[PDB]
From a paper:
The ribonuclease in these processes is the RNA exosome complex, which degrades transcripts in a 3′–5′ direction and in a processive manner. The helicase can extract [name] from the ribosome and is expected to transfer it to the exoribonuclease core through a bridging factor, HBS1L3 (also known as [name]), but the mechanisms of this molecular handover remain unclear. We show that rather than a sequential handover, a direct physical coupling mechanism takes place, which culminates in the formation of a cytoplasmic exosome–ribosome supercomplex. Exosome and ribosome thus work together as a single structural and functional unit in co-translational [name] decay, coordinating their activities in a transient supercomplex.
Reasoning that human SKI7SKI might bind to the SKI2N38 gatekeeping module, we proceeded to visualize this interaction in the context of a minimal complex. To favour the open conformation of [name], in which the gatekeeping module is dissociated from the helicase module, we purified a complex that lacks the [name] arch domain ([name]Δarch) and assembled it with SKI7SKI. Cryo-EM analysis of this sample resulted in the reconstruction of the complex in the open state at a nominal resolution of 3.4 Å, revealing a small unexplained patch of density on the convex surface of the [name] superhelix. To build an atomic model in this density, we used the knowledge of the protein boundaries we had obtained experimentally to inform targeted predictions with AlphaFold-Multimer29. These predictions reproducibly converged on a model in which an [name] helix (residues 451–464) fitted seamlessly into the experimental cryo-EM density, with two hydrophobic residues (Leu454 and Ile458) binding in the cleft of [name] formed between TPRs 29 and 30. The interacting residues between [name] and [name] are evolutionarily conserved in higher eukaryotes, but not in budding yeast, which diverged in terms of both the general structural elements and the detailed amino acid sequences that underpin the [name]–[name] interaction. Notably, however, lower and higher eukaryotes converged on the same regulatory mechanism; namely, that the recognition of the exosome bridging factor on the outer surface of the TPR scaffold protein is favoured when the helicase complex is in the open-state conformation.
Numbering used by the authors:
A (entry chain A): 1 to 122, 157 to 197
B (entry chain C), E (entry chain D): 1 to 305
C (entry chain B): 452 to 1564
D (entry chain E): 451 to 464
The structure:
């Protein structure tokens, strides 16, 4: 390089117009603006990095670790379990409905509500020691459950017998 | 036994590109029926369904990239939207001219959600926090913190005091608005969630994931009520009915399905929307369904009570 | 003797006061004499009635007097009413009814309000609701609109069963006089009756607001909360049930505060206390407040046994106040539940006999009180057959009696079937279960019994029966059975194509349902280690490793106090494996330390955890131990491969090579060993061992079903030798062989993006096809096609909705996690800015570089290791952001960024070059001379980081801008030589064109020393030899026109350039301009008109402007 | 075109 | 009994990479014998067999990826070719300069086939349709639709009114040109077909599959006339003789075999072509056979009448 300055005429000439080029993409595609200034090239620094190269990719696919081997899989353990069943959990019991509704009252003539009293359907309030002892006080039907027991189910020819 | 379902309205070309979000708001006491959609553009066009059709009212713009999320308020006439442009500008929705403009990058806000009283407009960030802003008051007053990955979905219970949040890798977090402390974290799925919603009188949380499953969890505990698996592709959006009896889900297999929570089955499926469906919503009362898809079409259906 | 005067004097004495009424001699004497003188003056007998009624009290005679008065004047409603009221007080209902009927028979249209009300209230008191209803409608239509009639009508309507008009009447009563609360309470009661408990609860709370002591509202709230708790217990929600039970108990004790004599409240409290049975002990802790726990002391916390004892006490109190068989049976059931809880936890044995005796006595008393209730008989039978008693004869008798009492008894039938089934009676148990199923198609216990029988007989549909049972009502037995069967079916590995595994485990989606089932089961029971292990195994299949680890941890805690041979060691091993998989290497090492390392599984897991943490020597030791133990030779080969891998991680590649060779010599190689050997050869630069291993893999291995891995290995083999062209050929061959497999198309797109980026159109097409072919490859496919479009530039039909910006936005929406998408977004924004500048319409998307750079950094920070790729990505992102900021004009922000980067770390040449460009943007923008010191600094900085064409081109531009033609030419030659040596192609063309442009410019200055035209000609000829460059041919035309100007050849060249198709608009415009110039010099008007119309067919303004300008000289 | 067997033999010898 | 067979011509290196397609056309009335080959490049070089050898005449190019299919017309001098480049550019074959260029991706067109009157130039797409273009007339006037997977082979009867189509997974579809309605679908094989051809006075359709079998079906019904199983590897191309007595098949086991439909046996086998063979064709009269393989070699054989 000589580094001799070479002065160019300051006016281009109105009669002729400047040459401003622009580059578009990697695969050659140029064009031309009218207006004198920067070279104005698109993606000056290249395409961006995108994905890594195939050598690193295979190094990472295998030589990372032995965890991708099938000897450290979800299979290759040969598990086994032992079956327990429980018929007795198939018993069901229901609860009897409440026997009273606590139905309102009415004044006879010019119906008005005096209060609420509990009707039947068809000291020291902390509940101390209220348990019931000395049973068999009234007579209800005198039923016997110990001597003659049914054996034959309805619809069924014979019945299972227990000693 | 299955009720009669009919479209009754199909729009030919609402926008010029794929539609990414839709919001249906019965904000005013009278029959407003405001519909706001955003589709890969600056356009946040506001439509109105007056008697039997949709009429375009506003074509407001001012974004630079595709808008990814839009939301509408039920108390005051207002709307909000976010995009990849890194700008949260909320519109008036009456004259539609740029009430405000908030600066927040994709590292600061992804999706939008109005407060039940329309006061906070919370968003979710990349670093996992849940940034809560203030409408008409200020910027970035506080943010709930969780130690996780990118967060996608933000949901509010219709009575407050709750805030759910789905994230990439499937971890779901639940916060309480009153205190702001992490109550319990649900493992959920192994794929991104990108869809969450509560229910009225909120006691059920429905999650949609990227693996095709739909989990039904129970709030105030960690009990899951079941897993619904009827779709073949990704599930993108899930909306709940005003009454706790059905909910609509839209997947990537070009099918819009409506389920029922009581029996956990799909009562009906709509085979429309030849391309992916990016949004489904209910109206004020559970009679009509709006749906926007990847193809430039807005579909409204009819679901009787 | 005037009766009227005597009457009026009697009235005078009556009205004078109470004293004159009490004096018997005036009032009575005058009324009796008047009544004697005139017997038809009914009013006199009425007033004698009043006198005797209120002063004397003789009700029977008074009634008779009022009756005669009403017989004399049937319009005197007062005498009639008083006669009726006294008849009712005298229990003489027949006369009262006769009177009321006579009145209402004469009352053709209303005007009998008193009689209607009497008869309606009487019939409401009696069991005559229909007649009461009729009387109430008549009274309502009488004319009065008072509520007291509307409420009676509504109550009677509710009593008969109607729920619509009752609500109407209650609403009317509330609307006309709101002060009454009973109507709103009855409305809430109706709402409660037809389900919808929440609305009833809200109404009850609103009612309790105004008045806090209404007992009915508290009772309603308690009942609603109890029903909600039971509904919650129908599903497996123990916390919800406990909370509802606590609230109901609070309301019940609040109501008992006010009315303590009501058996209803006591029995409801007992029911609420005993409802929480067999629900997760150590999860039930209830707050009970006030009087219930002896002395009134704040609030207390009770456990399950204490709650059951309180329920027993409440039942006892209710029984004491009211003796009914229902409460007797409830007390018996409560004692039975207490005995079950005492026995279940193993706290005691043989000391619960008293509770069973008490329950048996209470139930026997109840069943003997009324021996017609299937409920009592069934309860007696169930309690009798308990394991602590075992009276099977009495149980059978009771079940038969319950069946006989009512024919449709599915519960008794299934209880009998269960009893027969457990006593080895398969046939009769099947018969009883079938009977129960026929009598009730929607009962779960009979279905469970059928499934159990099918399993006991070894059928083929046991799994289907269990699945149907689990779907029906979520019972524990069916849950465990279905989970066990699914786990066993999954465990067997030879069923993969038997059409039983396929259907069972894929069309019905058995695994997720089994997982949910096991979660519910473990919530309810939570003392079954096998259930925990099954849940962990299922979670492992679902890639739910954290839940699996938690389940294994709980199983470990449960199993520590066990026999510990197989169950506990396996639990430890599984917990360690899962823990190691989710990080936590120290915890995995500790877990694998606490077990005898004598089995292959434990040793291999310990070795893997050690390797993951580090400690390659210990890992190799453990692998050698496993090798010493090994059998099952495939496992030995895999152990050898792992040993080679760990040896390589320690460097020392020769021993790993010998280990892989040893694995290859073995009787039958494995695919993993050969792949590892090929990759190891690729890691080194040998490239021959890799070829041999690839040949081995291709020769005799075909069962592998991954074309992507083999294609990738072959492509890497070809790329290692530096060919860089055969990679695309190999991948095209692979794609042709397998037109499916979208992975191959995506790989082709990526490879054409990286190597040989001249088939950019093909890469875009391959990316689009790969995105079309599937859905989960869309992310990478869209990224690659976006980069290929960026490479193309603007070589399209200028169609919207298909540009690189749109595709990169779509990719960003699909997965906003990777940094490459954000970097491509930055590049696309810059390219769009350049395109808009070229079209000259508007700049758009101006300022987002800082946000995109921050996003790139944040997304880079979260990757495991791609060190070189990550560094290149960050460098490119930073450089592009700085360049874009400089271009847009935010010099201060760019300078701050550069200064921060240089403060963060010591200087690196690239950042110093960026800082030089930032500083030199303001200076030399406007014409200004610069010191030679600054020029030397710039040249030195360019030298600092060499072998980069951009920097050399920039320094050449700086030299030219200040003006140094020789220096700029030298720099362009240096950049050309560097680009040609480095194998780049775009840089060579760019250097040629830039040199040609500079030399043509200097020639246009009409300078002497005509060597610049020679440079122009050589550069343009070389560019044309390289490729077909329209710019180069146009430069040739400009130089040739400047030399000759006149020579015809020049017009021929210009006409060729302007008329031959396939040319850019701007070059054609310039050629048109000079052609018009040359012909105006040549003075051919026909050709000028041809040029004008040619310009008019296309779009142009400048050519027509100059045409007009020179037309008007 | 060196195959696996020759490589193993050569490396074992050295 | 087996006739005398001889090669009489072997080319050393026709191209630089694997050869994927070949077409032999006696288009003009006189002795033209035009041979067009495409091989994993832009090169669609046109050769001519004048008396006893091949002389290279055209080296026309302009593709970016490997060319997958080539075809030649029998009425007019014209040629066509398609590749992974997503471009169907038809050449003049007389002067050889890029008469036209049609845009169609691998999702729009895979293989080429000229009309019996050389008017339509139909292709097959991924979505299963059969796109029919128009030479000299226009682009994409219509396409026959079937609901299936990737389609590979497209065949025309020598009298018209028929169009067969083989696809990946073995499903074979037959259309009628007169109406364009799906007549009947044949289950075929369970592996890709990638080869189909009719016969003159068409009543026989011969299919080659990926499992090594060669089925001989009868058109206008669903009756299959037999299965020929002599090959050991994949069968890639099958061409039928001008007289209904023989047909030639080329497999991936480096063997070219000729069968006879009358007796269903292999009359001769050629053991050449050390690597895979991707194409075999007959000439105007059944005297010579051309064959191109995966190795860059062109083999011409001789089969006496």
């Amino acid at each position: 390089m000589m580094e001799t300055e070479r002065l160019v005429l300051p006016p281009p000439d109105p009669l002729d117009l400047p040459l401003r080029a622009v580059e578009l993409g990697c695969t050659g595609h140029w064009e031309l603006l009218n207006l004198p200034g920067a070279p104005e090239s698109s993606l000056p620094h290249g395409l961006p990095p995108c994905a890594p190269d195939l050598q690193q990719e295979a190094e990472q696919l295998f030589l990372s670790s032995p965890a991708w081997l099938p000897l450290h899989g979800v299979e290759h353990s040969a598990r086994k379990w032992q079956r327990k069943t429980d018929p007795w959990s198939l018993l069901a019991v229901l609860g009897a409905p409440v026997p009273s509704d606590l139905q309102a009252q009415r004044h006879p003539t010019t119906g008005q509500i005096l209060g609420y009293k509990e009707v039947l359907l068809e000291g020291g309030m902390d509940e101390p020691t209220i348990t019931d002892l000395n049973t068999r006080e009234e007579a209800e039907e005198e039923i016997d459950f110990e001597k003659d027991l049914l054996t034959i189910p309805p619809g069924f020819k014979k019945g299972m017998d227990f000693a | 036994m299955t009720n009669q379902y009919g479209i009754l309205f199909k729009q030919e070309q609402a926008h010029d590109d794929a539609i990414w979000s839709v919001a249906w708001g019965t904000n005013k006491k009278e029959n407003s029926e405001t519909v706001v959609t955003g589709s890969l553009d600056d356009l946040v066009k506001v439509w109105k369904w007056r008697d039997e059709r949709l009429d375009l009212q506003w074509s407001l713009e001012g974004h630079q990239l595709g808008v990814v999320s839009v939301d509408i308020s039920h108390t005051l006439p207002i709307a909000a939207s976010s995009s990849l442009d890194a700008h949260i500008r909320l519109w008036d929705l009456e004259n539609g001219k740029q009430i405000k403009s908030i600066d927040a990058g994709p590292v600061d806000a992804w999706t939008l959600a109005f407060s039940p009283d329309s006061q906070y407009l919370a968003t979710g960030t990349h670093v996992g926090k849940v940034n809560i802003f203030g409408v008409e008051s200020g910027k970035k007053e506080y943010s709930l913190d969780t130690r996780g990955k990118f967060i996608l979905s933000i949901a509010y219970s219709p009575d407050g005091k709750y805030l759910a949040s789905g994230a990439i890798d499937g971890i779901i977090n639940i916060f309480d608005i009153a205190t702001g402390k992490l109550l319990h974290t649900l493992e959920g799925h192994a794929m991104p969630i990108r869809s969450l919603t509560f229910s009225p009188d909120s006691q059920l949380l429905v999650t949609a994931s990227d693996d095709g499953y739909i989990k039904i969890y129970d709030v105030q505990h960690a009990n899951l009520a079941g897993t619904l698996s009827g779709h073949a592709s990704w599930v993108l959006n899930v909306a709940f009915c005003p009454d706790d009896t059905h909910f609509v889900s839209s997947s990537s297999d070009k099918s819009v399905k409506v389920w029922d929570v009581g029996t956990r089955t799909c009562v009906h499926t709509f085979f429309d929307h030849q391309d992916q469906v990016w949004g489904v919503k209910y109206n004020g009362n559970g009679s009509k369904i709006v749906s926007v898809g990847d193809d430039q079409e807005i579909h409204i259906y009819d679901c009787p009570i | 003797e005037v009766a009227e005067y005597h009457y009026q004097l009697g009235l005078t004495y009556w009205f004078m006061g109470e004293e004159t009424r009490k004096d018997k001699t005036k009032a009575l004497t005058h009324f009796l004499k008047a009544a004697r003188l005139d017997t038809y003056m009914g009013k006199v007998f009425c007033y004698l009635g009043h006198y005797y009624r209120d002063v004397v009290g003789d009700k029977n005679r008074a009634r008779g007097c009022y009756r005669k008065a009403f017989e004399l004047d049937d319009t005197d409603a007062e005498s009639g009413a008083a006669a009726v009221d006294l008849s009712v007080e005298l229990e003489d209902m027949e006369m009262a009814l006769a009177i009321l009927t006579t009145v209402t028979q004469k009352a053709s249209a209303g005007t009998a309000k008193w009689a209607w009300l009497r008869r309606g209230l009487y019939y409401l008191k009696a069991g005559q609701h229909s007649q009461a209803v009729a009387d109430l409608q008549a009274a309502l239509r009488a004319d009065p609109k008072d509520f007291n009639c509307w409420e009676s009508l509504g109550e009677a309507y509710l009593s008969r069963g109607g729920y619509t008009t009752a609500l109407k009447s209650f609403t009317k009563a509330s609307e006309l006089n709101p002060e009454s609360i009973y109507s709103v309470f009855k409305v809430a009661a109706i709402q409660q009756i037809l389900g919808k408990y929440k609305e009833a609860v809200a109404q009850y709370q609103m009612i309790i607001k105004k008045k806090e002591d209404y007992v009915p509202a508290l009772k309603g709230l308690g009942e609603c909360h109890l029903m909600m708790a039971k509904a919650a217990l129908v599903d497996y929600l123990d916390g919800k049930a406990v909370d509802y039970i606590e609230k109901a108990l609070e309301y019940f004790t609040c109501a008992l505060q006010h009315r303590a004599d009501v058996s209803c409240l006591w029995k409801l409290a007992g029911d609420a206390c005993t409802c929480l049975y067999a629900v997760a002990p150590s999860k039930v802790n209830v707050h009970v407040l006030g009087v219930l726990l002896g002395q009134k002391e704040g609030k207390q916390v009770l456990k399950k046994n204490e709650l059951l004892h309180l329920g027993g006490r409440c039942y006892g109190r209710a029984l004491k106040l009211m003796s009914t068989s229902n409460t007797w049976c409830d007390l018996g059931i409560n004692y039975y539940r207490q005995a079950q809880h005492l026995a279940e936890t193993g706290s005691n044995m043989n000391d619960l006999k008293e509770l069973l005796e008490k329950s048996l006595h209470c139930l026997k008393k109840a069943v003997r009180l009324d021996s017609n209730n299937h409920l009592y008989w069934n309860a007696l039978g169930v309690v009798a057959c308990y394991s602590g008693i075992g009276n099977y004869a009495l149980a059978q008798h009771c079940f038969i009696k319950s069946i006989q009492s009512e024919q449709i008894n599915a519960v008794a039938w299934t209880n009998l079937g269960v009893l027969y089934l457990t006593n080895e009676n398969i046939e009769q148990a099947h018969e009883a279960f079938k009977m129960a199923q026929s009598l009730d198609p929607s009962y779960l216990m009979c279905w469970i019994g059928q499934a159990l029988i099918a399993e006991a007989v070894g059928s083929y549909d046991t799994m289907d029966l269990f699945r149907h049972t689990t779907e029906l009502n979520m019972h524990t037995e069916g849950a465990l059975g279905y989970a066990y069967w699914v786990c066993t079916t999954l465990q067997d590995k030879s069923n993969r194509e038997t059409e039983l595994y396929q259907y069972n485990i894929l069309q019905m989606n058995a695994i997720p349902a089994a997982q949910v089932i096991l979660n519910k089961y473990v919530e309810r029971i939570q003392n079954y280690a096998p259930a925990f292990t099954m849940l962990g195994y299922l979670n492992e299949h679902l890639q739910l490793k954290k839940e699996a680890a938690n389940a294994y941890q709980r199983a470990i805690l449960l199993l520590q106090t066990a026999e510990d041979q197989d169950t506990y060691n396996v639990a430890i091993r599984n917990y360690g494996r899962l823990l190691c998989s989710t990080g936590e290497y120290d915890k995995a090492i500790q877990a694998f330390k606490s077990t005898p390392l004598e089995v292959l599984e434990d040793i291999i897991g310990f070795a893997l955890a050690l390797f993951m943490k580090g400690l390659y020597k210990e890992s190799s030791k453990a692998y050698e131990r496993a090798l010493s133990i090994v059998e099952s030779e495939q496992d030995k080969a895999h152990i050898l491969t792992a040993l080679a891998i760990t040896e390589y991680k320690q460097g020392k590649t020769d021993v790993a090579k010998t280990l892989l060779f040893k694995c290859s010599i073995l009787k039958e190689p494995t695919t993993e060993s050969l792949q590892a050997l090929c990759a190891l050869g690729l890691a080194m630069q040998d490239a021959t061992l890799s070829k041999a291993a690839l040949n081995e893999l291709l020769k005799h291995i075909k069962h592998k079903d991954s074309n992507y891995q083999r294609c990738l290995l072959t492509s890497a083999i070809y790329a290692l030798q530096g060919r860089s062209v055969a990679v695309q050929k190999q991948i095209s061959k692979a794609v042709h062989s397998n037109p499916g497999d979208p992975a191959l198309w995506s790989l082709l797109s990526r490879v054409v993006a990286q190597y040989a980026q001249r088939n950019a159109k093909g890469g875009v097409v391959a990316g689009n096809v790969a995105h079309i072919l599937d859905s989960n490859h869309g992310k990478k496919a869209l990224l690659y096609t976006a980069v290929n479009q960026l490479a193309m530039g603007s070589s399209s039909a200028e169609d919207e909705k298909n540009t690189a910006l749109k595709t990169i936005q779509k990719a960003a929406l699909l997965s906003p996690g990777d940094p490459a998408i954000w970097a491509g977004l930055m590049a696309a924004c810059h390219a769009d800015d350049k395109l808009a500048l070229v079209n000259n319409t508007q700049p758009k998307r101006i300022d987002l570089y800082l946000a995109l750079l921050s996003a790139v950094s944040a997304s880079i920070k979260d990757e495991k290791f791609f060190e070189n790729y990550n560094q290149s990505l960050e460098k490119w992102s930073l450089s592009q952001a700085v360049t874009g900021l400089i271009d847009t004009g935010r010099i201060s922000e760019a300078e701050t960024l550069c200064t921060k980067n240089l403060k963060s770390n010591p200087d690196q040449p690239a950042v110093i070059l960026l800082l030089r460009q930032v500083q030199c943007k303001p200076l030399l923008e406007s014409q200004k001379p610069l010191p030679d010191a600054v020029l030397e600094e710039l040249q030195k900085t360019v030298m600092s980081n060499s072998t980069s064409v951009p920097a050399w081109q920039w320094l050449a531009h700086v030299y030219q801008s200040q003006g140094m033609m020789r220096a700029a030419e030298m720099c362009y030659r240096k950049s050309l030589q560097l680009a040609s040596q480095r194998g780049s192609w775009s840089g060579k063309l760019s250097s040629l064109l830039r040199l040609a442009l500079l030399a043509l410019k200097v020639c246009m200055a009409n300078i002497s020393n005509d060597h610049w035209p020679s440079l122009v000609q050589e550069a343009t000829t070389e560019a044309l030899k390289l490729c077909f460059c329209p710019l180069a041919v146009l430069l040739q035309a400009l130089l040739q026109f400047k030399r000759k100007m006149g020579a015809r050849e020049t017009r021929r060249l210009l006409e060729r350039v302007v008329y031959q198709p396939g040319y850019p608009k701007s070059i054609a415009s310039t050629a048109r301009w000079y052609l018009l110039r040359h012909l105006y010099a040549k003075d051919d008007y026909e050709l000028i008109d041809v040029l004008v119309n040619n310009a008019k067919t296309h779009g142009d303004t400048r050519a027509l402007e100059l045409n007009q300008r020179l037309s008007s000289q | 075109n060196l195959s696996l067997s020759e490589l193993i033999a050569e490396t074992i010898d050295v």
